[PDB]
């Protein structure tokens, strides 16, 4: 990304610049490693100790330690890792092109998959900071709300940011209301994260505070979301059922 | 039989095949993941017409939603010649991997049954017969390493075998420098006199185990000499000792019923039988609670955010807490009303001190709070209380109406053998999740062996 005086004030540009830097560095690392592996397989290059260990891991499907620099599920094979790599780099290319074309102003309207970010918690913090800067409110006074919209082209409000790739484990969302379901996972459509001034509103009995885990392992928690219950189901049933949200499957 | 190298290559590295973005079509009845699986499987020449055949099959959905699809996989692969039974088995394995990975292990068992015999895996699904193995298949100088998962003790098996064979056995617990001297003296006596020696919890002494392996390599033991080493599965055990010993892995039998039976057996009868009469019922609830959290650990990350060590120490602490609080409240009364039980003290302590201390995630703490609030309450003493509601979506489990320990133990013994995740509050499909995880855990493991 092309850093400038105007765009550095945007928290979103700072987050995406850090993400692009980390992704580019890891991309060069993996590309060099794979080029060396292909050279070894052709007989051009000899097997060094590090290279020999790399062939040992790649042949068995083990992810090498040299490749893991962002949080991922433990025990992942290499194909899933490189596929997630391709998706993340394509997202980074798209956001970089958007920044170059329309400046930082387009970073708000772009729909970012939190699964495709190396640290989506920073993205949530950046959205909070952007809303605080735009509306001149303190960061403490802002609280998060979620709107699930199935309509294509749902316009985003000034304080609303689009997200994609969310998965809902243990529940189905209809009319922005949860219902217990027997499906293992349901793909959430475009999800609008909206920051609003924290009104002194009583916590409704029909509100459940689900987590938003980074991935299916549920090792890392990004944030929490309050959702309304469609029926008269006990919220405790959602806790016993282990209902949750994952940025990526 | 042909090698079936290509089919096994797809079985182990089918995901390695690449699907171009947008190349995956939508197929009626198949989810997105099944669509990617079918597209990957279509690369092989036998499954080239797989998508059209799946679309044309009217009875596909009943197979896809079936509880045991592996037994009746439809014929979809195209064959130029009729296939051998093993060819049908591997093709069915590929189809089950593509459509119902949750049943893959079951399908895998059938493949083994198709190749190595029906009774091949059966002998492991049986009680361990240590008598013949130790008598015939174990030399005196090869130590019998009985490794257990943490929290499970297997010395009872060796004591039972020693009782059955009528052989004197000397058992020493290695937990201090003195125990090393006692073990050395006992082994020096038994190696000459041919006695049986057992060393308990030897994982606590890795270096001494290396010394014992070096010592064992040099001895000329008597024929009837046997050395059992009971330990917990830890990586600190020496590699050479495992290499130079007979390893037997003991795990607890999964299920709430066995868990409650083990808890009741472990607790002394006098402790539960103490006055007031209500104490036993609380113990039953505590036992049920300790079962529900423990079995749920199998279904992580769904059951819990991470695998906590809810072991016997927590159970003993909970029992001590219950004993202290009931002794304080009752003051020796033979009976106390259910209302007078200090429910708040028990809920708070087992929510923060006994079991909650290990819990670091706030959400798991919330789940533990929900379980304790649901179970530990005055309504537990009502005859209509339901330990688990909507079991299987239609049935429920009721509290036992008895008051003595024997009534609860009989109720546990009379529980149904068929346990689903709904007993623990999880949804039934959680089982369908766990198997598929293990299913992937199978293939990846085989990739490390390929």
UniProtKB/Swiss-Prot annotation, chain B:
It is found in: Cytoplasm, Cytoskeleton. The modification N6-acetyllysine is found at residue 386. Residues 108-324 are annotated as: AAA 6. The modification Phosphoserine is found at residue 265. Cytoplasmic dynein 1 acts as a motor for the intracellular retrograde motility of vesicles and organelles along microtubules. Dynein has ATPase activity; the force-producing power stroke is thought to occur on release of ADP. Plays a role in mitotic spindle assembly and metaphase plate congression. Belongs to the dynein heavy chain family. It is linked to Charcot-Marie-Tooth disease, axonal, type 2O: An axonal form of Charcot-Marie-Tooth disease, a disorder of the peripheral nervous system, characterized by progressive weakness and atrophy, initially of the peroneal muscles and later of the distal muscles of the arms. Charcot-Marie-Tooth disease is classified in two main groups on the basis of electrophysiologic properties and histopathology: primary peripheral demyelinating neuropathies (designated CMT1 when they are dominantly inherited) and primary peripheral axonal neuropathies (CMT2). Cortical dysplasia, complex, with other brain malformations 13: An autosomal dominant disorder characterized by global developmental delay with impaired intellectual development. Some patients show signs of peripheral neuropathy, such as abnormal gait and hyporeflexia. CDCBM13 is associated with variable neuronal migration defects resulting in cortical malformations. Homodimer. The cytoplasmic dynein 1 complex consists of two catalytic heavy chains (HCs) and a number of non-catalytic subunits presented by intermediate chains (ICs), light intermediate chains (LICs) and light chains (LCs); the composition seems to vary in respect to the IC, LIC and LC composition. The heavy chain homodimer serves as a scaffold for the probable homodimeric assembly of the respective non-catalytic subunits. The ICs and LICs bind directly to the HC dimer and dynein LCs assemble on the IC dimer. Interacts with DYNC1LI1; DYNC1LI1 and DYNC1LI2 bind mutually exclusive to DYNC1H1. Dynein heavy chains probably consist of an N-terminal stem (which binds cargo and interacts with other dynein components), and the head or motor domain. The motor contains six tandemly-linked AAA domains in the head, which form a ring. A stalk-like structure (formed by two of the coiled coil domains) protrudes between AAA 4 and AAA 5 and terminates in a microtubule-binding site. A seventh domain may also contribute to this ring; it is not clear whether the N-terminus or the C-terminus forms this extra domain. This is Cytoplasmic dynein 1 heavy chain 1.
